[PDB]
Design a binder for this molecule. Sequence first.
Ligand SMILES: *[C@@](O)(c1nc2ccccc2s1)[C@H](CCCNC(=N)N)NC(=O)[C@H](CC(C)C)NC(=O)Cc1cccc(CNC(C)=O)c1
Ligand SMILES: [Cl-]
Ligand SMILES: [Cl-]
Ligand SMILES: [Cl-]
Ligand SMILES: [Cl-]
Ligand SMILES: [Cl-]
Length: 241
Amino acid sequence: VVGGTDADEGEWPWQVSLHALGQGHICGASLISPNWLVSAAHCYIDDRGFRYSDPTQWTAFLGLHDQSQRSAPGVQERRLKRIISHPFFNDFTFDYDIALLELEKPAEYSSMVRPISLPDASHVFPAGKAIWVTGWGHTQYGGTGALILQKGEIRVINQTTCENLLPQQITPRMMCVGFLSGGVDSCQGDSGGPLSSVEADGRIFQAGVVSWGDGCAQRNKPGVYTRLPLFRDWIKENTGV
Ligand SMILES: *[C@@](O)(c1nc2ccccc2s1)[C@H](CCCNC(=N)N)NC(=O)[C@H](CC(C)C)NC(=O)Cc1cccc(CNC(C)=O)c1
Ligand SMILES: [Cl-]
Ligand SMILES: [Cl-]
Ligand SMILES: [Cl-]
Ligand SMILES: [Cl-]
Ligand SMILES: [Cl-]
C-alpha cells in the first residue's frame, strides 16, 4: 500500500498473509468462514521454477500485524488443502481474477481473527464510495514491502473513466478504485487482499480483491480490483458460505 498508514492491532481481523516456498509474504487473502479464504487466482500460478499452484507450499497467517512478529499472541498459522480458481480466470487478460483457498484446519475465531461479510449479488459499490485497502505490499512502486500491515482509504472510480484510462484492459469483472490524482493505492504484495467497505449501518462488506495496476499510486492509473458481488453464488456453490 502506497500513501497509507500503519493499521492498528486487530483492526482488520479478516486480512490474511500468504507465504510460500520460504519466500515470506507473497499475497494477501481474506477470511470468509472458519475454513475458507478469498484471494486472487493470479497468485497461485507456477512461475520461474516455483510451484505456486501447489497448495501444500503455502502457509496462511491469520491475526498477523507485523511480518517480523509471526509468533505474537493471537497469530494463527494454517496450511492450505486446496486452491479453487474461478473457471473463467485466465492469465492473459486476468479476467475473473478470484480464487477460494481451503484451510487444512479451521481458523479459531477471536478478536484478532474473524471473517468479513460477503455482499449480495445485487449490491453495487457506486462511484465515489469510500473503501479501505490493506496489505503488506510495497509502499512505493519498485520499493519494498511493509513489516506492519498498512491501510489506506480510496474511492470507487467511474467505470467509463476506468475503461478509458486503461484502454483494452478493463472488463466488467474489474473496478478501478483509488484517486485520479494518485497518491494512495495498493501495490505489489497486496494482491489477493480485500477491499473493506463500511456501509451505511456500520457493517463492513468485502468490496473486491486486489488485482493489478499500471505502476502504483500514479495519476490517472488507479488500482484495478476484481468485483465481488458478481461472485456471491459461485462462492456459495463451492464453499457453502
Ligand atoms: C499483487 O500484489 C501481486 N501479484 C503477484 C503475482 C505473482 C507473484 C507475486 C505477486 S504480488 C500485485 C498488486 C498490484 C496492484 N497495483 C496497483 N493497485 N497499482 N499485482 C501485480 O503485480 C500484477 C500481477 C499480474 C499477474 C496480474 N501485475 C500488475 O499489476 C502489472 C500490470 C498488469 C496488467 C496490466 C498492466 C498495465 N501495463 C501496460 C503497459 O499497459 C500492469
Ligand atoms: Cl466453512
Ligand atoms: Cl493447518
Ligand atoms: Cl460492485
Ligand atoms: Cl471518478
Ligand atoms: Cl492529467
